[PDB]
Amino acid sequence: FEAIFGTFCNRLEWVYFLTSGLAAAAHAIKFHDLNKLTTGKMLFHVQVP
Amino acid sequence: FEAIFGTFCNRLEWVYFLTSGLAAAAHAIKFHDLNKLTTGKMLFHVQVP
């Protein structure tokens, strides 16, 4: 006879965005209506000494 | 629509003569009547051994 000793299944290494070093450079917000906005803008007012 | 987020005004930082290290090189005297005069003289008397 030939013997099949066993079948092994791989184990996945799950990851998330908020649990990684690159996330510190980021800052994450949920909005639910992003399709409706056209462009987001800042606005800076600066005075020079 | 077009979304405008928070607007920022410059957080201008203050600086002073006294707080600077250059003030140690200086002696600072305030004198409310300085406008009237234009002459300031000091005199040195030395005898050499």
Side-chain angles (χ1 to χ4, degrees), chain A residues 1-8:
Chain A
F1 53 79
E2 73 162 29
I4 169 169
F5 285 113
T7 67
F8 309 156

Side-chain angles (χ1 to χ4, degrees), chain B residues 31-47:
Chain B
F31 180 70
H32 324 291
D33 202 5
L34 185 61
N35 296 77
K36 288 186 183 64
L37 71 91
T38 51
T39 288
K41 65 186 73 170
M42 297 176 67
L43 288 93
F44 291 85
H45 169 92
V46 52
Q47 191 160 125

